[PDB]
């Protein structure tokens, strides 16, 4: 499955964790809060996100929602000589 690294890391940590992320990232990008073009919420939302980022809120939310998720030989491998 080709998906975003964030969802990938989250899933690869969840039980039964029978999935694994392979290789590096195919590119670099980011999630943004959207607003209708010409919206009155455009500027306040931008400043809110800058404030949240500069205050460590986004890092804490990410850490809380992602990181906190977290012999003897048998007859099967010697059956050849018995056959």
């Amino acid at each position: 499955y080709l998906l975003e690294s964030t969802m990938n890391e989250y899933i690869e940590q969840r039980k039964p964790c029978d999935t694994m992320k392979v290789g590096g990232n195919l590119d670099s990008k980011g999630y943004g809060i959207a607003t209708p073009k010409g919206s009155a919420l455009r500027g306040p939302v931008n400043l809110a996100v800058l404030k949240l980022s500069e205050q460590g809120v986004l890092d804490k939310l990410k850490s809380k929602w992602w990181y906190d998720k977290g012999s003897a030989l048998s007859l099967s491998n010697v059956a050849g000589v018995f056959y």
């Binding site: 969802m7 929602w65 992602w66």
Partner: peptide
Amino acid sequence: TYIVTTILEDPYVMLKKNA
């Protein structure tokens, strides 16, 4: 009050156990 449109996607938006 206006609507913040969203989507269901773990771990961004989840319905609480016994929603």
